[PDB]
Structure 1
């Protein structure tokens, strides 16, 4: 399946891969007894905006290093700058 072979509709569906059981585990880990129906859609939306802000900083770091491959250092710089510092990868 070489070449472009790109099919792109007006909508997107890869976000929906994160489904109710995936959301349910996080809700239970946070102690939430029950979760409403529309929270599943909002949680997917919260994931989208949170990821978008992180990648914006990380992309700038990656290109400044003339790198075509993302590394743990690049995502740490974006996370540390935004305040959500991660320990465990890189250093």
Structure 2
């Protein structure tokens, strides 16, 4: 058998979920090639933020990533986040 669920990866971010997301942005009609590209885009964003978060985590000699690290890592990219402390 070969499942590895659909890639054991980003492909669990299913199509209709992206559809709902595009619906939030007011969009009506989407092409079939969008999905994959969006996924790649998402990955890049996450990568950068997570990297920074992990780096903050590494400075405190912890093995648990806290919310605060995510907040700060987001703040440095100009995407400050409210509602989780800081």
Counting matched residue pairs gives 86
RMSD of aligned alpha carbons: 3.1
Contact 2:57-2:64 within 8 A present in 1 as well: yes
Question: TM (normalized to structure 2)?
Answer: 0.88
Q: In 2 relative to 1, CA 9–23 (structure 1 residues): closer, same or farther, beyond 3 Å?
A: closer
1:11 to 6, 11, 15: 6
SS at structure 1 position matched to 2:33? helix
| Aligned-partner Cα distance in 2 for 1:36–1:10 | 24
Gap runs ≥5 in structure 1: 1-5
- 2:37 is aligned to 42
The structure 1 segments of at least 4 consecutive aligned residues displaced by more than 2 Å after TM superposition are 6-13
Gap runs ≥5 in structure 2: none
For the pair shown, which has the larger CA radius of gyration, 1 or 2? Answer: 1
Cα drift, residue 43 of structure 1: 0.9
